[PDB]
Amino acid sequence: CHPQGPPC
Amino acid sequence: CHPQGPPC
Amino acid sequence: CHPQGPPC
Amino acid sequence: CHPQGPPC
Amino acid sequence: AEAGITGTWYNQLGSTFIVTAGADGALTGTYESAVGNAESRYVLTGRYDSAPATDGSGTALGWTVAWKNNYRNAHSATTWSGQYVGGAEARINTQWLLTSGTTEANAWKSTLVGHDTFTKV
Amino acid sequence: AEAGITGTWYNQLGSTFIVTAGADGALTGTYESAVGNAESRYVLTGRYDSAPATDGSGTALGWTVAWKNNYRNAHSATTWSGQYVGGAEARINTQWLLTSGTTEANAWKSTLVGHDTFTKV
Amino acid sequence: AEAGITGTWYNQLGSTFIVTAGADGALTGTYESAVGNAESRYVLTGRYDSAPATDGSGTALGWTVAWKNNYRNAHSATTWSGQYVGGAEARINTQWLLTSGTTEANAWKSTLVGHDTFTKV
Amino acid sequence: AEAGITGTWYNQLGSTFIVTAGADGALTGTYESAVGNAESRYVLTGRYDSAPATDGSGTALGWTVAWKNNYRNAHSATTWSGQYVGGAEARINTQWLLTSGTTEANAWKSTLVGHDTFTKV
């Protein structure tokens, strides 16, 4: 879960 | 006017 | 190890 | 002759 | 996919692409530009995954058009890379690369990049 | 180009590509990965400009590999777009796009981009 | 552009970008991810053309985010490249490149490519 | 990286880039074109990872140049995305996107893509 993606 | 584009 | 890469 | 290219 | 791919697709600028997806991974058809005309038709060829994953993943695919036919030679070729997603509102989402033939002094600016979505409607 | 394209090409990571360029713009052959093996061979198909400009411009071309054969299915496809330059030290310079089949939540990160140079040596 | 750029922009996945466009071409602000949170905020910096053409052409611009803040380090950086178009329904249309830090054996697959549209709504 | 990045870098076409890497992730400097000249100098700004992984992974980074200075306005902007690799023969490997400001009818062909390697030599 990369920060560019949804969420987080 | 390249054929990939609009028109022609 | 994707086939495009080295090796395999 | 765009400034990114060679020369200028 | 396979039978789901076979047919007519339209993009957001008015271009039309007609394709057959063959049983062992082959794509074959024609591409025609906006206006629509006997003279804006070009040959396409590509490949697709003929046994995709059974979860809700898309089917990966790619094809090429060289921009030369009997009426016109634009000295360039485009590749599209993307995936088919099926169902009620099926679509093909792609990104593309267009390279022109150039002299070596001009080679650093030979290639454009962009993106298209194709629908059955 | 045409006869100049037909043959074996090698890239900087150890991959090998064997191609026939047909008289009316067709490219057909096989791609094989590093190691080199009966089982790292995949089908390729593409198109090239069969009447290029007579000045020192390159010949524009493109091809596709779907990464499925009888031994392996990687659920992805790569397109290469570029130009052939001939002469003493002939080469094909390309940029490429690799798309994996994904769920819709993962679609924003489905595609990698990079670049290769192929030589006859 | 300039005053037209300054403000809050939203993309199609739920991310928010707040920017000031300075008189001599500077862009400065913060990017925050979906959820929206004190801990999904990252610094951005870029440049824009401060004297664009007077016809209906867009304003060209670009910015960078390194994905490290006080709570998280993802060892990667994204650049967006695009143009601002103003008027009733203003938008910024972009394409982007995301590179991860890798070992040399993994360097061929270090970079993803995609595209976003930002609106004021 | 940090101190390893700070300095003068040269690419394969004759361009020169001078950069300071600041303690909390900032990159600032100037870019100058081939010829080398008081009038081919443009401002650059970007970001880099100031705490990279301790294994042999590269440091991820990105920067932007808007092509306007006191002598010339080319109505365009370039972003470079890549990673620094240190040691005996340090280099920065990148891919780039160049967008021109266009009318909406021309927007599909607004962006070029390519790649550069920078060295200290």
XYZ file of C-alpha atoms in Angstrom:
516
model
C 0.000 0.000 0.000
C 2.046 2.821 -1.509
C 0.985 6.309 -0.275
C 0.200 7.476 -3.893
C -2.567 4.857 -4.099
C -5.964 4.546 -2.327
C -5.948 4.437 0.780
C -3.225 5.401 3.275
C -2.210 15.847 -39.738
C -1.022 12.407 -38.656
C -3.550 9.607 -39.416
C -3.773 8.632 -35.665
C -5.252 12.065 -34.898
C -8.631 13.674 -35.776
C -9.355 13.919 -38.789
C -7.887 12.152 -41.837
C 11.101 -13.694 -11.854
C 9.238 -12.418 -14.906
C 10.381 -14.062 -18.193
C 11.371 -10.625 -19.702
C 14.038 -10.248 -17.000
C 17.338 -12.110 -16.352
C 17.180 -15.184 -15.915
C 14.390 -17.657 -16.729
C 15.698 23.983 -31.714
C 14.327 23.327 -28.234
C 16.773 24.283 -25.421
C 16.790 20.653 -24.045
C 18.369 19.462 -27.308
C 21.845 20.027 -28.850
C 22.711 22.965 -29.381
C 21.311 26.241 -28.014
C -11.919 -12.776 -22.956
C -11.395 -14.216 -26.565
C -15.021 -14.027 -27.818
C -15.395 -10.979 -25.515
C -12.636 -9.146 -27.426
C -13.768 -9.966 -30.991
C -15.775 -7.065 -32.442
C -15.791 -3.324 -33.010
C -14.321 -0.877 -30.446
C -14.500 2.996 -30.464
C -12.295 5.519 -28.674
C -12.942 9.021 -27.390
C -11.535 10.819 -30.531
C -13.724 9.008 -33.147
C -11.330 6.161 -34.223
C -12.633 2.631 -34.941
C -10.762 -0.693 -34.488
C -12.151 -4.070 -35.721
C -10.455 -7.267 -34.269
C -10.543 -11.063 -34.287
C -9.006 -12.843 -31.298
C -7.835 -16.290 -32.357
C -7.819 -19.372 -30.142
C -4.056 -19.411 -29.501
C -3.360 -15.784 -28.612
C -3.375 -13.995 -32.027
C -5.099 -10.585 -32.648
C -5.701 -9.506 -36.327
C -7.766 -6.637 -37.881
C -7.844 -3.030 -39.179
C -7.685 0.471 -37.634
C -9.473 3.491 -39.194
C -9.184 7.142 -38.402
C -11.784 9.836 -37.759
C -13.807 10.760 -40.861
C -14.019 6.990 -41.572
C -12.896 6.255 -45.106
C -11.479 3.610 -47.483
C -8.162 5.355 -47.304
C -7.871 5.821 -43.550
C -7.727 2.017 -43.083
C -4.454 0.428 -41.804
C -3.542 -3.236 -40.888
C -3.122 -4.188 -37.164
C -1.510 -7.234 -35.541
C -0.937 -8.224 -31.801
C -1.159 -10.889 -29.014
C -3.366 -11.510 -25.950
C -3.355 -13.951 -22.939
C -5.665 -16.849 -23.949
C -5.917 -18.333 -20.408
C -6.442 -15.363 -17.986
C -6.750 -15.624 -14.181
C -10.127 -16.688 -12.849
C -10.408 -13.978 -10.192
C -11.641 -10.510 -11.289
C -8.291 -9.657 -13.018
C -8.224 -8.141 -16.551
C -6.825 -9.876 -19.690
C -3.439 -8.371 -20.790
C -2.963 -7.542 -24.515
C -0.955 -5.370 -27.056
C -1.018 -4.511 -30.843
C 0.931 -2.509 -33.506
C -0.112 -0.274 -36.531
C 2.547 0.900 -39.098
C 1.087 4.116 -40.701
C 1.512 3.118 -44.363
C -1.244 1.967 -46.724
C -1.882 2.374 -50.534
C -2.802 6.058 -50.259
C -0.453 7.553 -47.589
C 2.923 6.986 -45.859
C 3.502 8.775 -42.550
C 6.888 7.065 -41.672
C 5.924 6.054 -38.140
C 4.468 3.165 -35.988
C 2.244 3.063 -32.828
C 2.057 0.280 -30.138
C -0.813 0.084 -27.651
C -0.334 -1.891 -24.312
C -3.296 -2.538 -21.882
C -6.007 -4.902 -20.533
C -9.539 -5.951 -21.415
C -12.149 -5.764 -18.623
C -15.489 -7.464 -19.396
C -19.039 -7.382 -18.080
C -21.890 -4.923 -18.490
C -19.685 -2.063 -19.499
C -16.687 -3.711 -21.046
C -13.674 -1.641 -21.958
C -10.048 -1.779 -23.032
C -7.791 0.663 -21.134
C -4.391 1.387 -22.813
C -1.246 3.555 -22.854
C 0.583 4.045 -26.258
C 3.934 4.964 -27.813
C 4.249 6.606 -31.332
C 7.775 6.607 -32.860
C 8.661 8.558 -36.097
C 11.702 7.550 -38.303
C 14.372 10.380 -37.735
C 17.965 11.365 -38.449
C 20.370 10.627 -35.549
C 20.537 14.334 -34.601
C 16.773 14.247 -34.054
C 16.533 10.863 -32.337
C 16.139 12.293 -28.747
C 12.672 13.628 -29.679
C 11.391 10.678 -31.820
C 8.613 9.305 -29.450
C 5.287 10.522 -28.114
C 3.292 8.931 -25.248
C -0.448 9.079 -24.424
C -3.494 6.972 -23.423
C -6.867 5.742 -24.832
C -10.056 3.995 -23.580
C -12.065 1.901 -26.032
C -15.786 0.964 -25.586
C -18.360 -1.126 -27.573
C -20.722 1.860 -27.741
C 15.511 -2.066 -44.111
C 13.510 -5.363 -44.815
C 16.462 -7.714 -45.531
C 18.464 -5.542 -43.080
C 16.013 -6.385 -40.268
C 15.715 -10.153 -40.881
C 18.030 -12.064 -38.528
C 19.088 -12.463 -34.917
C 19.314 -9.470 -32.527
C 20.724 -9.396 -28.916
C 20.086 -6.893 -26.130
C 22.180 -5.755 -23.188
C 20.571 -8.201 -20.637
C 21.182 -11.451 -22.630
C 17.791 -11.803 -24.467
C 17.607 -13.038 -28.087
C 14.983 -12.131 -30.742
C 14.776 -13.876 -34.172
C 12.644 -12.077 -36.897
C 11.489 -12.267 -40.508
C 10.411 -9.011 -42.155
C 7.930 -9.766 -44.921
C 7.572 -7.784 -48.138
C 4.365 -5.961 -47.154
C 5.175 -4.757 -43.644
C 4.761 -7.922 -41.483
C 7.232 -8.937 -38.680
C 7.038 -12.569 -37.325
C 9.366 -14.596 -35.006
C 10.220 -15.711 -31.438
C 11.666 -14.064 -28.296
C 13.792 -16.003 -25.751
C 14.947 -15.021 -22.325
C 18.346 -15.152 -20.634
C 19.550 -18.704 -19.925
C 18.310 -19.589 -23.453
C 16.021 -22.595 -23.325
C 13.190 -24.484 -25.077
C 10.826 -23.175 -22.474
C 11.821 -19.514 -22.471
C 10.598 -19.171 -26.089
C 7.519 -16.963 -26.804
C 5.782 -15.941 -30.127
C 6.194 -12.322 -31.422
C 4.237 -10.382 -34.052
C 4.503 -6.699 -35.339
C 4.662 -4.238 -38.312
C 7.349 -2.079 -39.976
C 7.436 0.678 -42.699
C 8.277 -1.136 -45.979
C 9.067 2.074 -47.950
C 11.215 4.307 -45.634
C 12.528 7.794 -46.501
C 15.613 7.920 -48.688
C 17.526 10.444 -46.578
C 19.434 9.141 -43.510
C 16.188 8.623 -41.475
C 15.578 5.363 -39.531
C 12.833 2.781 -40.322
C 9.951 2.895 -37.748
C 8.694 -0.440 -36.305
C 6.842 -2.110 -33.307
C 6.061 -5.678 -31.986
C 4.171 -7.487 -29.149
C 4.941 -10.600 -26.922
C 2.174 -12.121 -24.671
C 4.055 -13.986 -21.838
C 2.271 -17.348 -22.147
C 3.680 -20.516 -23.719
C 3.262 -24.309 -22.992
C 5.363 -24.207 -19.818
C 4.522 -20.865 -18.084
C 1.813 -18.158 -17.866
C 2.848 -14.774 -16.465
C -0.492 -12.913 -17.205
C 1.089 -9.925 -18.936
C 2.097 -8.471 -22.396
C 4.995 -6.208 -23.588
C 5.055 -3.832 -26.649
C 8.305 -2.418 -28.026
C 8.219 0.819 -30.217
C 11.389 2.133 -32.039
C 13.459 2.439 -35.262
C 16.034 0.422 -37.172
C 19.265 2.224 -38.152
C 21.490 0.347 -40.636
C 25.096 0.446 -41.789
C 28.334 -0.771 -40.247
C 26.980 -0.902 -36.753
C 23.295 -1.457 -37.212
C 20.988 -1.264 -34.240
C 17.367 -1.112 -33.152
C 16.688 1.507 -30.443
C 13.370 1.048 -28.522
C 11.232 2.110 -25.539
C 8.743 -0.497 -24.064
C 5.569 -0.848 -21.991
C 4.780 -4.009 -19.856
C 1.160 -4.312 -18.603
C 0.040 -7.012 -16.047
C -3.670 -8.151 -15.797
C -4.987 -6.642 -12.413
C -8.109 -6.116 -10.323
C -9.655 -2.624 -10.716
C -8.325 -1.532 -7.294
C -4.808 -2.237 -8.562
C -5.182 -0.820 -12.070
C -3.306 2.501 -11.335
C -0.032 0.548 -10.965
C -0.466 -2.004 -13.833
C 2.285 -0.715 -16.280
C 6.063 -0.481 -16.296
C 8.187 1.522 -18.786
C 11.840 1.095 -19.863
C 14.192 0.975 -22.893
C 16.410 -1.495 -24.854
C 19.081 -1.412 -27.619
C 19.487 -4.460 -29.850
C 22.661 -5.278 -31.895
C 23.713 -8.070 -34.353
C 26.753 -8.879 -32.203
C -2.511 30.965 -15.168
C -0.613 31.940 -11.879
C -3.622 33.022 -9.750
C -5.643 30.433 -11.737
C -3.354 27.633 -10.493
C -3.179 28.637 -6.801
C -5.671 26.598 -4.756
C -6.903 23.096 -4.024
C -7.115 20.408 -6.753
C -8.679 16.869 -6.506
C -8.067 13.805 -8.668
C -10.241 10.844 -9.579
C -8.846 8.510 -6.808
C -9.496 10.864 -3.817
C -6.044 12.592 -3.513
C -5.750 16.314 -2.662
C -2.977 18.749 -3.728
C -2.687 22.336 -2.349
C -0.366 24.764 -4.332
C 0.939 28.326 -4.474
C 2.217 29.568 -7.836
C 4.786 32.298 -7.270
C 5.365 35.266 -9.563
C 8.595 33.965 -11.128
C 7.679 30.380 -11.988
C 7.871 28.558 -8.596
C 5.239 25.982 -7.400
C 5.229 25.020 -3.640
C 2.722 23.027 -1.483
C 1.667 19.637 -0.035
C 0.150 16.396 -1.401
C -2.162 14.162 0.701
C -3.428 10.698 0.037
C -6.901 9.167 0.197
C -8.276 8.895 3.747
C -6.917 12.445 4.307
C -4.757 12.551 7.408
C -1.929 14.383 9.224
C 0.368 11.562 8.303
C -0.480 11.203 4.623
C 0.915 14.712 3.953
C 4.108 15.062 1.820
C 6.030 18.183 0.530
C 5.820 19.095 -3.221
C 7.967 21.421 -5.341
C 7.904 22.313 -9.148
C 7.975 25.007 -11.915
C 5.453 26.534 -14.355
C 5.597 28.945 -17.386
C 4.830 32.432 -15.970
C 4.257 34.075 -19.402
C 2.099 31.619 -21.470
C 0.964 32.156 -25.084
C -2.013 34.438 -25.578
C -3.915 32.146 -27.946
C -6.008 29.315 -26.411
C -2.878 27.220 -25.537
C -2.485 25.617 -22.065
C 0.188 26.571 -19.463
C 2.955 23.887 -19.175
C 4.013 22.764 -15.653
C 5.662 19.892 -13.595
C 6.242 18.934 -9.876
C 7.930 16.235 -7.694
C 6.939 14.390 -4.399
C 9.541 12.208 -2.527
C 7.464 9.669 -0.457
C 9.125 10.268 2.929
C 7.662 12.227 5.847
C 7.896 11.898 9.710
C 5.662 8.818 9.852
C 6.558 6.701 6.754
C 9.360 6.085 4.208
C 8.400 4.369 0.949
C 11.840 4.771 -0.830
C 10.458 6.231 -4.052
C 9.662 9.551 -5.907
C 6.913 10.606 -8.410
C 7.083 13.393 -11.098
C 3.956 14.738 -12.793
C 4.267 16.561 -16.237
C 1.236 18.356 -17.876
C -0.675 21.606 -18.614
C -3.242 23.824 -16.927
C -6.352 24.732 -18.964
C -8.537 27.491 -17.462
C -12.082 28.768 -17.841
C -15.431 27.497 -16.612
C -14.239 23.986 -16.051
C -10.562 24.356 -15.386
C -8.383 21.291 -15.160
C -4.810 20.050 -15.035
C -4.149 17.049 -17.320
C -0.940 15.058 -16.513
C 1.104 11.896 -17.157
C 3.420 10.612 -14.300
C 6.482 8.465 -13.591
C 7.049 6.653 -10.189
C 10.596 5.297 -9.595
C 11.493 3.005 -6.593
C 15.140 2.731 -5.270
C 16.365 -0.845 -6.352
C 19.409 -3.102 -6.514
C 21.109 -3.150 -9.956
C 19.674 -6.614 -10.737
C 16.191 -5.139 -10.327
C 16.776 -1.821 -12.090
C 15.003 -2.835 -15.394
C 11.641 -2.862 -13.560
C 12.099 0.245 -11.310
C 9.512 2.647 -12.972
C 5.751 2.788 -13.373
C 3.822 5.130 -15.721
C 0.205 6.391 -15.573
C -2.013 9.507 -15.880
C -4.239 11.810 -13.732
C -6.779 14.654 -14.227
C -7.207 17.215 -11.453
C -10.317 19.461 -10.998
C -11.369 22.246 -8.532
C -14.531 20.318 -7.635
C 23.508 10.014 -1.070
C 23.087 13.776 -0.046
C 26.769 14.855 -0.206
C 27.163 12.224 -2.973
C 24.565 14.034 -5.118
C 25.821 17.619 -4.632
C 28.004 18.668 -7.579
C 28.194 18.828 -11.354
C 26.710 16.076 -13.578
C 27.043 15.668 -17.419
C 24.864 13.705 -19.834
C 25.592 12.027 -23.148
C 24.398 15.009 -25.329
C 26.627 17.716 -23.711
C 24.172 19.187 -21.102
C 25.364 20.229 -17.615
C 23.344 20.212 -14.347
C 24.651 21.746 -11.062
C 22.767 20.716 -7.807
C 22.704 21.140 -4.035
C 20.966 18.424 -2.017
C 19.707 19.895 1.243
C 19.471 18.027 4.538
C 15.684 17.544 4.478
C 15.094 16.297 0.939
C 15.332 19.497 -1.199
C 17.216 19.676 -4.577
C 18.023 23.191 -6.012
C 20.268 24.343 -8.936
C 20.546 25.240 -12.653
C 20.458 23.334 -15.974
C 22.432 24.487 -19.060
C 22.254 23.318 -22.616
C 24.928 22.286 -25.109
C 27.122 25.186 -26.266
C 27.215 26.291 -22.587
C 26.221 29.926 -22.282
C 24.807 32.628 -19.969
C 21.557 32.394 -21.830
C 21.118 28.627 -21.907
C 20.803 28.579 -18.086
C 17.416 27.610 -16.517
C 16.319 27.131 -12.820
C 15.697 23.552 -11.498
C 13.895 22.332 -8.371
C 13.117 18.747 -7.016
C 13.110 16.257 -4.064
C 15.153 13.192 -3.024
C 14.911 10.465 -0.281
C 17.147 11.689 2.593
C 17.182 8.321 4.455
C 17.718 5.574 1.785
C 17.846 1.810 2.461
C 21.116 0.467 3.809
C 21.386 -2.475 1.412
C 22.804 -1.809 -2.095
C 19.569 -0.050 -3.275
C 19.720 3.298 -5.158
C 18.393 6.660 -3.830
C 15.122 7.725 -5.592
C 14.844 11.354 -6.832
C 13.039 13.724 -9.347
C 13.304 17.391 -10.599
C 11.555 19.898 -12.957
C 12.820 22.621 -15.452
C 10.327 25.150 -17.008
C 11.983 26.337 -20.309
C 11.681 30.099 -19.725
C 14.490 32.459 -18.710
C 15.312 36.174 -19.490
C 16.365 35.468 -23.079
C 13.962 32.747 -24.386
C 10.492 31.224 -23.788
C 9.839 27.767 -25.240
C 6.352 27.214 -23.598
C 7.118 23.776 -22.177
C 8.361 21.892 -19.014
C 10.437 18.675 -18.479
C 10.394 16.296 -15.420
C 13.141 13.733 -14.834
C 12.436 10.648 -12.539
C 15.259 8.186 -11.508
C 17.812 6.994 -8.896
C 21.335 7.842 -7.791
C 23.824 4.944 -7.566
C 27.125 5.763 -5.811
C 30.613 4.305 -5.595
C 33.575 4.334 -7.956
C 31.533 5.116 -11.001
C 28.543 6.950 -9.661
C 25.658 7.751 -11.947
C 22.081 8.978 -12.085
C 19.841 6.918 -14.409
C 16.550 8.644 -15.457
C 13.499 8.575 -17.755
C 11.843 11.977 -18.683
C 8.604 13.556 -19.909
C 8.510 16.887 -21.928
C 5.058 18.545 -22.247
C 4.394 21.586 -24.568
C 1.416 24.007 -23.935
C -1.161 23.243 -26.805
C -4.677 23.989 -28.018
C -7.235 21.284 -27.083
C -7.297 19.949 -30.673
C -3.567 19.265 -30.362
C -3.539 17.915 -26.808
C -3.247 14.179 -27.830
C 0.308 14.823 -29.101
C 1.565 17.217 -26.342
C 4.178 14.900 -24.602
C 7.487 13.309 -25.522
C 9.288 10.554 -23.550
C 12.991 9.571 -23.444
C 15.904 8.682 -21.109
C 19.284 10.081 -19.888
C 22.343 8.899 -17.879
C 24.374 11.481 -15.970
C 28.031 10.991 -14.826
C 30.605 13.087 -12.847
C 33.089 12.838 -15.726
